[PDB]
Design a protein around this nucleic acid. Sequence first.
DNA 1: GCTTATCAATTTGTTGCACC
DNA 2: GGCCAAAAAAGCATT
DNA 3: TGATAAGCAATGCTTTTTTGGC
DNA 4: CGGTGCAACAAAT
Lengths: 93, 96
Amino acid sequence: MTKSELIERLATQQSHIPAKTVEDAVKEMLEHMASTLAQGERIEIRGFGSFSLHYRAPRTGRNPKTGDKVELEGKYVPHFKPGKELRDRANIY
Amino acid sequence: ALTKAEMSEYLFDKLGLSKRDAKELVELFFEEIRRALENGEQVKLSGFGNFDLRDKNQRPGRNPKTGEDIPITARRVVTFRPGQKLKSRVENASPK
DNA sequence: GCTTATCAATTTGTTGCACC
DNA sequence: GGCCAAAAAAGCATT
DNA sequence: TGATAAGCAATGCTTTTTTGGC
DNA sequence: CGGTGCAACAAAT
């Protein structure tokens, strides 16, 4: 399922809301989530999961294609931790 | 931390949605993603990232406290692979 | 190729958010 | 809603 | 904690998805 | 609108 397909499904279920608004709402929520992370703040939705930032120390990396060294600066990368309801529902075993 | 309440209020301010429709929409949004993953489907949100399913086979574990070697049952887990656009946006961020 | 994440069990303290 | 072409983003290689 | 699984540095080419007008 | 109880959280172990 892609973002547009998600919007299509939500639209159908939220018949009282104009398809357009649903699409605008989804785009808005995703930006609010991205923006929150860029501000270095976490996200915590009970029953879905939480998003946090993980630090990566600076390091001498490589261009995997040529093998040339590249100096990389410290940084932060998004990280998702799925919630209980989501873990259970997703686990078919 | 960003919460559903905060997301709801934001839709209210930014799109003028009723505090009722806004609240329902946020919840339906997360539920719809859970449903897809629950039905073994991948979720790809361009500009953000992907929620992928991975099947794991039992592997060696233990009790972190005691140490009793207990196995990690096989299982299907949800993972998230942030996209490049989102990764670039938070690389130089700083924990607030 | 090397770095980071997954996970096990239990206790203790915090919080999203359903409910009133 | 679809159809279209251009742009954006992701996917691949290998990551 | 410790065996095991997942993710990634550069980047050009390909493929998928989105965007905006009809 | 705001107050409360608590499973879902985080983090230590």
